[PDB]
Amino acid sequence: MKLSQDSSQIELLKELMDLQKDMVVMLLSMLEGNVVNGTIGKQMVDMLVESSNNVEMILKFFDMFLKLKDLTSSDTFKEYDPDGKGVISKRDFHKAMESHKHYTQSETEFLLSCAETDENETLDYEEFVKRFHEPAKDIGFNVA
């Protein structure tokens, strides 16, 4: 949550997401060879219960940035940005999210905060989604 808003910590957030993916891979290796009602599984479930709130925040993060790409690929967003260059104004981006109505007001504000600011307020949703959705996709798959 902290590093996504600032645009000067993109590399640090990428490194942190890589570390998170490696940790989840380690956990999957721990579950490798699992049996029904296993001790390792029970301990991992206890660990999750201990980290319930953090898992909640991570899952909300992932769900938000997974819905991002579907919202972008919706043809209404193509209406707001008829040209294929990939630059859309911040006003049009907020309108696109409001009309797509997949998101809540808090989520809309959070994507606005994470959105890279432009002198023309015309962000590149292409780099936005390639920066956020893809790590969301590949860590979220292992989490699932």
Swiss-Prot record:
Domain notes: The calcium release channel activity resides in the C-terminal region while the remaining part of the protein resides in the cytoplasm.
Role played: Cytosolic calcium-activated calcium channel that mediates the release of Ca(2+) from the sarcoplasmic reticulum into the cytosol and thereby plays a key role in triggering cardiac muscle contraction. Aberrant channel activation can lead to cardiac arrhythmia. In cardiac myocytes, calcium release is triggered by increased Ca(2+) cytosolic levels due to activation of the L-type calcium channel CACNA1C. The calcium channel activity is modulated by formation of heterotetramers with RYR3. Required for cellular calcium ion homeostasis. Required for embryonic heart development.
UniProt protein name: Ryanodine receptor 2
Induction details: By TGFB1.
Assembly and oligomerization: Homotetramer. Can also form heterotetramers with RYR1 and RYR3. Interacts with FKBP1A and FKBP1B; these interactions may stabilize the channel in its closed state and prevent Ca(2+) leaks. Interacts with CALM and S100A1; these interactions regulate channel activity. Identified in a complex composed of RYR2, FKBP1B, PKA catalytic subunit, PRKAR2A, AKAP6, and the protein phosphatases PP2A and PP1. Interacts directly with FKBP1B, PKA, PP1 and PP2A. Interacts with SELENON. In cardiac muscles, identified in a complex, composed of FSD2, CMYA5 and RYR2.
Organism of this sequence: Homo sapiens (Human)
Compartment annotation: Sarcoplasmic reticulum membrane
Protein family per UniProt: Belongs to the ryanodine receptor (TC 1.A.3.1) family. RYR2 subfamily.
Disorder named in the UniProt entry: Ventricular tachycardia, catecholaminergic polymorphic, 1, with or without atrial dysfunction and/or dilated cardiomyopathy: An arrhythmogenic disorder characterized by stress-induced, bidirectional ventricular tachycardia that may degenerate into cardiac arrest and cause sudden death. Patients present with recurrent syncope, seizures, or sudden death after physical activity or emotional stress. CPVT1 inheritance is autosomal dominant.
PTM description: Channel activity is modulated by phosphorylation. Phosphorylation is increased in failing heart, leading to calcium leaks and increased cytoplasmic Ca(2+) levels.
Span of the entire protein shown here: 3956 to 4099 of 4967
Tissues expressed in: Detected in heart muscle (at protein level). Heart muscle, brain (cerebellum and hippocampus) and placenta.
Mutagenesis / variant outcome for changing I40V: Decreased function in release of sequestered calcium ion into cytosol by sarcoplasmic reticulum. Changed ryanodine-sensitive calcium-release channel activity
